[PDB]
Amino acid sequence: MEQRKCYFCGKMLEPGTGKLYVKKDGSTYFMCSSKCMSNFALGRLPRRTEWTEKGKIQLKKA
């Protein structure tokens, strides 16, 4: 059972759910939900988005 992490929110992909998104350059990103996929496609960054773990890490950097 592959254990997968959401690229945007950093949450573990629950088995039997979630998406894998592949760009032209072979880059692969796990998405836990349509919300994370939409925010990734909008160009928003997780480190700037507060509800994600990367945004939380960026804020707690201070």
């Binding site: 059972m1 629950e14 088995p15 039997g16 759910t17």
Partner: protein, 337 residues
């Protein structure tokens, strides 16, 4: 005219498509007895769907041996009571009910369905049935059973549902003996079905009320310029000039759903006793949480949540002994997420 052909819109195998006359599915056929005596059917209530991660044990499949995510239907299956034994006589005009014996003690909430049969003749009724079997007036025996939904909480009803079930035995005497053993008892779903086996599921489908021919039969819409000339969701023609009538085979609006349907070869993936194993966080939406014993049926089942689902041993199963599924993970994440 050189015509383009298409398959007919919908199936005429379910006509007339009317509302089912009861909320309970009735079985018109019972399969062959192929072993020790037992009931051929059980009845539970549909809860909802989840999914499991399991190892593909299906022989000859390409993905056999690997992790696969399989949707499952959860069916809450409290113990049913064997209320009565009914005997049937076969003649030229078919089967007729000839005798019935009710169990001496029955659940008090059965009065919501019927006035309770008294604790009257059971010994002499059984000996009468034995005499009838000995003298050859009995063609077969069925068990009248009923569910006890009071123990459930996602099903609001306390009135039991009553239905006839076949008995699987090699001989009529064996059938009668087994029915006498099981009469008046509480049978669990493990006493009817085993894990990993195929079954047939009957249920009343989701009711959609009155629906047009587009949704009801899958007829094409009007296309292009015709889409906005005033008949968009509406059948092109009701018939030819001759014959001067609308055929019953022309797709038309009417009752959609709330029909009896039988699905074949649904595999049981788990017989559980504790509903906490399958209940997600937050509960099943509009249902709640499982509390009694339950069953996992591979794939989908007819009917919505809380509908009574009748399970029976398979009547057209292809595959031989399938095995016990290896459920590696039952998903209990929030279905409301």
């Amino acid at each position: 005219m050189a015509s383009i052909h298409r398959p007919k819109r919908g199936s005429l195998a379910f006509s007339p498509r009317k509302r089912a006359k009861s909320h309970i599915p009735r079985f018109r056929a019972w399969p062959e007895a192929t072993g020790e005596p037992k009931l051929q059917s059980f009845a539970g209530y549909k809860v909802g769907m989840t999914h499991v991660i399991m190892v593909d044990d299906t022989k000859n499949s390409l993905t056999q041996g690997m992790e696969i995510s399989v949707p499952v239907t959860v069916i809450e299956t409290p113990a049913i009571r064997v209320a009565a034994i009914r005997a049937y006589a076969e003649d030229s005009t078919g089967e007729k009910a000839i005798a019935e014996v009710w169990a001496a003690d029955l659940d008090p909430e059965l009065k919501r369905r019927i006035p309770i049969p008294a604790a009257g003749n059971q010994a002499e009724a059984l000996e009468n049935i034995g005499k009838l079997i000995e003298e050859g007036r009995v063609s077969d025996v069925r068990a009248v059973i009923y569910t006890l939904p009071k123990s459930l909480t996602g099903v609001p009803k306390k009135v039991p549902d009553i239905m006839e079930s076949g008995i699987s035995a090699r001989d009529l005497g064996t059938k009668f003996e087994y029915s006498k053993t099981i009469l008046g008892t509480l049978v669990s779903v493990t006493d009817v079905f085993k894990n990993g086996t195929l079954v047939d599921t009957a249920a009343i489908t989701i009711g959609k009320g009155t629906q047009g021919p587009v949704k009801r039969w899958g007829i094409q819409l009007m296309k292009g310029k015709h889409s906005r000339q005033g008949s968009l969701r509406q059948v092109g023609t009701l018939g030819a000039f001759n014959p001067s009538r609308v055929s019953w085979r022309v797709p038309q609006m009417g009752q959609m759903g709330y029909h009896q349907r039988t699905e074949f070869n649904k595999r049981i993936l788990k017989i559980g006793s504790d509903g906490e194993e399958v209940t997600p966080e937050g509960g099943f939406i509009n249902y709640g949480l499982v509390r009694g014993d339950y069953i996992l049926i591979k794939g989908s089942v007819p009917g919505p949540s809380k509908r009574l689902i009748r399970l029976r041993d398979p009547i057209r199963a292809k595959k031989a002994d399938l095995g016990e599924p290896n459920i590696l993970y039952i998903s209990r994440e929030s279905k409301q997420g």
